[PDB]
Amino acid sequence: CTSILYSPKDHYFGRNLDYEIAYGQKVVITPRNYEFKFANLPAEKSHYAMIGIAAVANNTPLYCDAINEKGLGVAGLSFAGQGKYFPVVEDKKNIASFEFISYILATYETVDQVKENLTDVNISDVSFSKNTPASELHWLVGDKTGKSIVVESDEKGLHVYDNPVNALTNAPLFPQQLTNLANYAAVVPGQPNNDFLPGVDLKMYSRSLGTHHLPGGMDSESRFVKVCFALNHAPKDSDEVESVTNFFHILQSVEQVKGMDEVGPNIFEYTMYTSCMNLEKGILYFNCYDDSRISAVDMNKEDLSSSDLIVFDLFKKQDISFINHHHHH
Amino acid sequence: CTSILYSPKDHYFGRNLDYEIAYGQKVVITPRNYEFKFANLPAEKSHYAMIGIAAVANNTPLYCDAINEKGLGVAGLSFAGQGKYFPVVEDKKNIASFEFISYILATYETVDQVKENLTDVNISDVSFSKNTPASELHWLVGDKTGKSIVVESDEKGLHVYDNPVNALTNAPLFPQQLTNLANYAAVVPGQPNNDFLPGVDLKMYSRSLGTHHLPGGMDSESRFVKVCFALNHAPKDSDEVESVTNFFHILQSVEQVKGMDEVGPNIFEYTMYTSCMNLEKGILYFNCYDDSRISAVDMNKEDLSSSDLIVFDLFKKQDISFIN
Amino acid sequence: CTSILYSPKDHYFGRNLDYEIAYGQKVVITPRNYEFKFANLPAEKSHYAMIGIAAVANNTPLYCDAINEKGLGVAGLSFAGQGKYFPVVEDKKNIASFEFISYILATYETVDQVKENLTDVNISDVSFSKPASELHWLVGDKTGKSIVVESDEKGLHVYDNPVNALTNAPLFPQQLTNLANYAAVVPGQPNNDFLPGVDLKMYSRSLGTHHLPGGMDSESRFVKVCFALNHAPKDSDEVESVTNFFHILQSVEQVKGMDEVGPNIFEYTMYTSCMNLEKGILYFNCYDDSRISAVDMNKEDLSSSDLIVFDLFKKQDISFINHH
Amino acid sequence: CTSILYSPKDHYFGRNLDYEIAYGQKVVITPRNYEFKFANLPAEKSHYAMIGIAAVANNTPLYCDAINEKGLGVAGLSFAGQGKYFPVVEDKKNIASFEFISYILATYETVDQVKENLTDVNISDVSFSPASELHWLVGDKTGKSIVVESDEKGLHVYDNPVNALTNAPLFPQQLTNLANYAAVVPGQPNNDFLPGVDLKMYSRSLGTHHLPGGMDSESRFVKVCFALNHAPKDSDEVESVTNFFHILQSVEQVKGMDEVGPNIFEYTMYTSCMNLEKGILYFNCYDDSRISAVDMNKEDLSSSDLIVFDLFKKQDISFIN
Ligand SMILES: [Mg+2]
Ligand SMILES: [Mg+2]
């Protein structure tokens, strides 16, 4: 998975979800008066409205990534082999991993608040379904200040990191992702000046030889480095549709195509969907592996004082526009 | 630019066109009785119909890439700094660079036929319009056999290469592109076996560490290596919509996003459009940088006995489906 | 800097010291009855004899790397920007950073002993003059195992070292994670699972090492030396072992001009030490002298009380074959 | 193999010989009146003297690399899978591959002269006893070099802008691959990678993080071009020789890293450094790190007998006690 915060003028938050199997994800709006029943926290019957991608089980949204009506966004990203959750304790605020997005977006408005208010939180090992383990995750949190934090629960506890590059993928731990980034400090989008072999005329046979060592792999570090680069150099001061178009192209630059990421014999991890959520406007734009067309759901076109989940299809078939048809005249 | 021939069941031929500025490209069907007038070749008043992406000037299609009604495909890809064209010569068949796609598609049906009949060819330095240079190009040619050839005119003349990887980008010369692939021979889509430090347990902390050195650059070699990999490992035995979807994802893997390939201060080469042509069906599928939705034009729903160019818009605005 | 523990038969411990400034290093033997005076530890007037590379100031050996008569070795390596030292505190055993090699080698015999007894240790911010240099350490012994000792912002950590090598930054767990990025490297030719069904042009020997790092930076040197060490010969006698040891560190040597640390200022491999743990023999050479020199600790009076000092840096010692 | 021409003040020409088996190589001085019996050229009983590394069989120097008394240098480097030799023909000057170094150094003085005189040359398929596939680096005291390659398309002579050579691929392809490393710098790059982001510049020389360290031919070529280009200038004799050995050591092959068969490894067997001005050969080998030196001009160059010294030596340890 790859998640980004993109700040051309408005602010846009979303992710690729890359995996080998779908889990019934949908587009889900949770209105202000849907009652959240948290495993070890008091129920919230009145809260901020939110919109994101979620599975729905027993009338409960299991969010993958979402934003709330105040312009805060949270995305959960696979963290297998690095994450650790901990038993419920009487002296911490226990948030189960599957409810982290819901609780944060129900309650909080800004990244600054989330950072100061995780000091007494424990990410618990509670799962939604009995006899089933919770998925191992870490989180990107971003807001309309254009800044983000990374939240990781690992064997040394809960950590919150300022995110200087507004992107996140999977393993390794976040400080280690930032160290690896500097290994690419010599990369440039155009042609480097020749300080490699001064006095020699190199055969500059292709454009953008400065990106010859930019990573294109499907692994977590390759996708992190490349999406950081694509995000940093993306256009700015763009209006809504141009911004959304640019956002999808950033995440497409680290798309996982079927065949290239083998996780088992003839089993492939691929980009199942891509979400793009406008923090200012409460609009979720999306497409998926089978449908290249971008779709949009505006949370603010619904009744946010209601109490039931509002659900739309996420996964769609290829929506081809047939320019040509039989000539009747 | 990046071009491929994809053979999951039907055969699909097409390309990314990556540049900084558009050249009036549109979807153009040339029907059987449009009269081709060539600089140094007999006129062809009757020929195979074709569909592809072209600029139109003076009622003449200037094709970027196209397929014909018999399932032959030709794509012209930028080859600046490597291509060389030559003055017309009496002892050769002279094809001007800008007419190469039109001529080959009007006249031949198979890759084999093209190879056989290029033996006496000179790619001439003639340009379409007076006082404008011919663009430097090389070409990928593919058909329904699932095989392709690369055609390159350079300082040593004309060369035709069998293409074992069914892909093409820009510089360097094609044998050099092929040698560079061997530099990636240890890449795998999954996890490698640890013969790097035998006896040590490595922390295989991410999926697909076998692709950690797969190139992701915007330069011509990086795109060639990566697209060869994406094409080789793509699904097979797909139906029409699934095959088209997978085709676009293959070329999406080497898409050039604005900002990443700088060809001048604040001037960027990016993926302007993506074409995907079904060789069996004569259907052209396309999208562009500004419109993610795939559009389709079926050549066989037009009147192929006509004599005039049939033209459709290529570049479109983002076509968002508003759900609620 | 690059330090290794090499275990072909006997056990060899040593390092390249890569820097832009020399600081008066010599070969120094400290006999058993030289009195160590530490800043916050009891004085040691009787202890283990050691041999290594040190600067001598105020009749006091400031070791860079050394081994003791029992076959324990400690090498200090630059850790700038990562190390953190702490004020002396009453609840801990405080070892100053510049005393670490002297104290550990004076007092302990094995890596296991060093590990057990670091549990209450604080690396103090005490200098030798009036600032200490930021360091971390490799500790190895004749079991063929080694540990890494790092004091950082989270305090003191001791890591088992599965690869028996150490360079500079980043923190040791990050160095291990980065190794997995090279899991597909092999010394020979990889099998082609990159483009199955395509015959690649395997044009050079050892294409499996095409992505092996050759940079002068800390991570590149770490990855490469781990590879060279892991694949080096075994079952060798003394001279063959020493020769192979020097070649391993040679594989990651820094040549003047490639590591620019300031305007026309370069970090380069100033010396290379190789110490036989079983035999107490230090072998060395330096940037200006390719010939290997040898000092045997056990050819000295180790019950003595004074430092025994030999020249480290030497001019090129050329054997002139013909004359007149 | 890796060969370089290094021009700090005097000019130094030499190579690493990387292989898995030795072939009786020794240091050989061939004096002016040794009679060269060329395969398909007239014999030469009076010619330039030369010094370098060679096998000797049937009183014949089979040179690997050498320089002559006039400051010309030629190194043969493995080129397996790329080189092609051709049958002896009546209308070309045929030079067998195993005698190319001998003939060039016996006959010519400068790189320009060699270029002019290769126009009608055929590198023939004649073998001394098949012939090993080679290509050649030729350099002189001008500080310039050329690459001589006989392949499928015939004999080619290339100007060498980087004064280095390894093995495959063909030389223009080596130069193309060089440009892939255009972004490498010896120190820290300016931050045009992620402008406005403070990177963790955690190591010195992060500019070289993508510099190749492989044992393969392209890795060694790129690295040695960089090491050679950035080496010190204006050095005196011993300082230059020291720097020269370090340049080649930056691409040396340690036993175990280059597997060419089951427990069979290609490694750096010897390293030669020949001063073009002074006619001195310096050498060491895998088993002896001490540099040895043979001076051609301390011998009788009006002689006719080969003058031979041992090349491979035991590790020459200086015992300080
Ligand atoms: Mg408690
Ligand atoms: Mg003839």
Author numbering:
A (entry chain C): 2 to 330
B (entry chain A): 2 to 325
C (entry chain E): 2 to 131, 134 to 327
D (entry chain D): 2 to 130, 134 to 325
Paper text:
To examine the molecular foundations of BSH substrate specificity, we determined the crystal structures of six of the Lactobacillaceae BSHs examined above: four glycine-preferring (LgasBSHb, LaciBSHa, LingBSH, LreuBSH) and two taurine-preferring (LgasBSHa, LjohBSHc) BSHs. We examined the sequences of these loops and found that taurine-preferring enzymes exclusively contained G-V/T-G (‘G-X-G’) motifs, while glycine-preferring enzymes solely contained S-R-G/S (‘S-R-X’) motifs. To confirm the importance of the selectivity loop, we first created two variant enzymes that swap the central residues in each selectivity loop: a V211R mutant of the taurine-preferring LgasBSHa and a R208V mutant of the glycine-preferring LgasBSHb. We found that both single-swap mutations significantly decreased the specific activities with preferred substrates without significantly impacting the non-preferred substrate. Second, we noted that R208 in LgasBSHb forms a salt bridge with E21, an anionic residue conserved in all glycine-preferring enzymes examined; in taurine-preferring BSHs, this glutamate is always replaced by glycine. We examined the activity of LgasBSHa G23E and LgasBSHb E21G variants and found that they decreased activity with the preferred substrate without impacting non-preferred substrate activity. Third, combining these mutations by adding a G23E V211R salt bridge in LgasBSHa further lowered the preferred activity, while removing the salt bridge in LgasBSHb E21G R208V did not further decrease the preferred activity. Fourth, we created triple mutants of the selectivity loop sequence. Both the LgasBSHa-SRS and LgasBSHb-GVG variants exhibited the greatest reduction in specific activities toward their preferred substrates, with little effect on non-preferred substrate processing. Importantly, without altering secondary structure, the triple mutations significantly decreased substrate selectivity from 76-fold to 14-fold for LgasBSHa and from 353-fold to 2-fold for LgasBSHb.
